[PDB]
Design an enzyme around this catalytic site. Structure first.
Site, PDB file in Angstrom:
ATOM      1  N   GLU A   1       0.814  -1.238   0.056  1.00 44.26           N
ATOM      2  CA  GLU A   1       0.068  -0.049  -0.023  1.00 44.26           C
ATOM      3  C   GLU A   1       0.790   1.222   0.027  1.00 44.26           C
ATOM      4  OE1 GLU A   1      -2.244  -1.308   3.655  1.00 44.26           O
ATOM      5  OE2 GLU A   1      -4.100  -1.528   2.490  1.00 44.26           O
TER       6      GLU A   1
ATOM      7  N   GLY B   1     -13.183  -4.134   2.756  1.00 49.21           N
ATOM      8  CA  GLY B   1     -14.154  -5.142   2.034  1.00 49.21           C
ATOM      9  C   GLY B   1     -15.417  -4.329   2.179  1.00 49.21           C
TER      10      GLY B   1
ATOM     11  N   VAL C   1     -12.949 -10.246   7.813  1.00 54.36           N
ATOM     12  CA  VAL C   1     -14.164 -10.438   7.884  1.00 54.36           C
ATOM     13  C   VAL C   1     -14.507 -11.254   6.256  1.00 54.36           C
ATOM     14  CG1 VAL C   1     -16.337  -9.759   7.542  1.00 54.36           C
ATOM     15  CG2 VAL C   1     -15.162  -8.729   9.304  1.00 54.36           C
TER      16      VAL C   1
ATOM     17  N   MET D   1      -9.252  -3.412   9.093  1.00 63.71           N
ATOM     18  CA  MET D   1      -8.707  -3.602  10.727  1.00 63.71           C
ATOM     19  C   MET D   1      -7.651  -2.527  10.999  1.00 63.71           C
ATOM     20  SD  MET D   1      -7.812  -7.557   9.430  1.00 63.71           S
ATOM     21  CE  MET D   1      -6.972  -8.308  10.935  1.00 63.71           C
ATOM     22  N   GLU D   2      -7.485  -1.347  10.802  1.00 61.78           N
ATOM     23  CA  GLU D   2      -6.747  -0.257  11.257  1.00 61.78           C
ATOM     24  C   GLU D   2      -7.220   0.955  11.216  1.00 61.78           C
ATOM     25  OE1 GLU D   2      -5.836  -1.893   8.250  1.00 61.78           O
ATOM     26  OE2 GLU D   2      -4.663  -3.495   9.121  1.00 61.78           O
TER      27      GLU D   2
ATOM     28  N   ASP E   1     -12.503  -6.343  -1.979  1.00 64.58           N
ATOM     29  CA  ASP E   1     -13.428  -7.406  -1.762  1.00 64.58           C
ATOM     30  C   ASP E   1     -14.788  -7.182  -1.228  1.00 64.58           C
ATOM     31  OD1 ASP E   1     -13.752  -8.113   1.340  1.00 64.58           O
ATOM     32  OD2 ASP E   1     -11.580  -7.395   0.828  1.00 64.58           O
TER      33      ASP E   1
HETATM   34  N1  LIG Z   1     -13.119  -7.913   4.303  1.00 65.50           N
HETATM   35  C1  LIG Z   1     -12.117  -7.544   5.083  1.00 65.50           C
HETATM   36  N2  LIG Z   1     -12.204  -7.770   6.320  1.00 65.50           N
HETATM   37  C2  LIG Z   1     -11.319  -7.092   7.510  1.00 65.50           C
HETATM   38  N3  LIG Z   1     -10.087  -6.536   6.790  1.00 65.50           N
HETATM   39  C3  LIG Z   1     -10.132  -6.507   5.276  1.00 65.50           C
HETATM   40  C4  LIG Z   1      -9.100  -5.751   4.748  1.00 65.50           C
HETATM   41  C5  LIG Z   1      -7.829  -5.137   4.952  1.00 65.50           C
HETATM   42  O1  LIG Z   1      -6.808  -5.957   4.204  1.00 65.50           O
HETATM   43  C6  LIG Z   1      -5.894  -6.375   5.303  1.00 65.50           C
HETATM   44  C7  LIG Z   1      -6.101  -7.971   5.530  1.00 65.50           C
HETATM   45  O2  LIG Z   1      -5.475  -8.574   4.703  1.00 65.50           O
HETATM   46  C8  LIG Z   1      -5.965  -5.697   6.592  1.00 65.50           C
HETATM   47  O3  LIG Z   1      -5.134  -4.456   6.697  1.00 65.50           O
HETATM   48  C9  LIG Z   1      -7.481  -5.024   6.561  1.00 65.50           C
HETATM   49  O4  LIG Z   1      -7.512  -3.659   7.059  1.00 65.50           O
HETATM   50  N4  LIG Z   1      -9.581  -6.021   3.512  1.00 65.50           N
HETATM   51  N5  LIG Z   1     -10.707  -6.429   3.343  1.00 65.50           N
HETATM   52  C10 LIG Z   1     -11.085  -6.977   4.706  1.00 65.50           C
END
Ligand SMILES: Nc1ncnc2c([C@@H]3O[C@H](CO)[C@@H](O)[C@H]3O)n[nH]c12
Ligand SMILES: Nc1ncnc2c([C@@H]3O[C@H](CO)[C@@H](O)[C@H]3O)n[nH]c12
Lengths: 229, 229
Positions: free
Chosen positions: A12, A79, A153, A173-174, A197
């Site tokens: 990123e 996501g 998730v 997640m951040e 996603d």
């Molecule tokens: N469906 C999802 N659920 C939780 N985190 C992520 C993410 C992000 O991508 C990373 C997880 O591989 C993490 O940094 C998170 O913020 N992408 N999709 C997500």
């Protein structure tokens, strides 16, 4: 003027370092490698925190107390929880919540921690500027609530849960921890994310696919904003 | 010599401030109030982080980067996961893990984050000293793995899960993040906890009951250790 730019994964931030095309000094601290350079008249500190709430909190705090940034812009992927958000779409966080916090045993609403709050707000002016720009390059910027926890998730159930409990549009997640720390130190923060996603059973596959691209889109926009500061 | 003492809740540090009986300067930073005083020949920084992983990470990082402590001792309460641990019992963490981290979607073991590790270790010398003292006052010090997450644990299911997945003896919400940050900055850390519940359906009641007392026990020991440094 000092500006902090954060990403979660190396992927990123790599595009970010490039787009700025300036030499960067590498300063290691707390298990993180900070890239310090000069862009125009502003001093920019870039870095990837690594995944999760603990990593992201740690890195933001370091960024503020050791480098004293005055603003924090975060770019990464997330996501989707709703239909109108699709792969590669760009979103700007209005409020963030830690969806995995549970003191229910103490009859507290989910996401609540004593002496704290469920929702954390982000910079009004930064978000405003984001919308300006998005409107200057015909970019469909969606805004909304982002949910953050330490779980990737990927299930229809959890999906519905975040929507019904927090009315969230995106999950990651951040975001929340970053926004939280900035608020505690009074630093304006902006959290921008690019869908990668739909947080369902196939989120893992879709994620491995769009990571690179979605990471880039997000990076381009963020660079656009820094140019305007 | 600079020493940092941490608690999660105000209740947990109040006894500490008293036992040291010295005047304390109050220094606010990042939404936390740090108590700085002098005890004997050592400088001690005390504070309660507030509940959770984000709060505890934030506070430990601040403690290290702004005050530059050289050691970190944590005292608080925790729920029990095993029989041989009972209310008021004292435990010293050997390894800590974030039991709520789940990147399973990416075929990772639970508790694992890329570029990180499942288990975090604590100070060998501090723990050694803890056992010395515990043996000098006939205190039954139990040692073991502590699991930390942002959920108050209170169900037989989750109980069995932490034991089988991580083989943990106690559960709480700040240990691991604290230990993690210290490790990243290379600061020796010791995490001491006093059981206050058995993490079952009635954990909430039991907790409200023993908080005060269990908090005290833990505080007494920690003060004993500081005396020996
Ligand atoms: N469906 C999802 N659920 C939780 N985190 C992520 C993410 C992000 O991508 C990373 C997880 O591989 C993490 O940094 C998170 O913020 N992408 N999709 C997500
Ligand atoms: N069974 C349990 N599960 C999770 N945390 C705790 C705790 C601790 O007490 C606080 C929760 O009120 C928090 O700081 C946490 O570390 N006691 N018992 C617990």
């Amino acid at each position: 003027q000092k500006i902090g730019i954060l990403g979660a994964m190396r992927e990123e931030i790599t595009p970010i370092l490039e787009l700025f095309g300036v030499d960067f000094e590498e300063i290691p601290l707390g298990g993180n490698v900070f890239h310090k350079g000069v862009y125009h008249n502003k001093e920019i500190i870039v870095a990837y925190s690594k995944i999760g709430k603990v990593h992201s909190t740690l890195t933001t705090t370091s960024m503020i107390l050791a480098f004293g940034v005055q603003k924090v812009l975060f770019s990464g992927v997330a996501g989707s929880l709703v239909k109108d958000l699709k792969i590669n779409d760009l979103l700007v966080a209005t409020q963030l919540v830690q969806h995995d916090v549970d003191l229910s045993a103490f009859d507290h609403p989910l996401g609540f921690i004593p002496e704290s709050a469920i929702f954390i707000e982000t910079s009004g002016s930064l978000n405003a500027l984001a919308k300006k720009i998005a409107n200057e390059q015909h970019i469909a910027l969606k805004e909304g609530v982002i949910a953050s926890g330490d779980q990737f998730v990927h299930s229809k159930e959890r999906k519905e849960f975040l929507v019904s409990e927090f009315k969230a549009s995106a999950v990651e997640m951040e975001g929340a921890s970053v926004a939280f720390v900035c608020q505690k130190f009074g630093v304006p923060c902006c959290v921008l994310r690019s869908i990668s996603d739909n947080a369902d059973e196939k989120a893992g596959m879709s994620f491995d696919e769009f990571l690179e691209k979605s990471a880039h889109t997000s990076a381009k926009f963020l660079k656009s904003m820094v140019d305007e500061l």
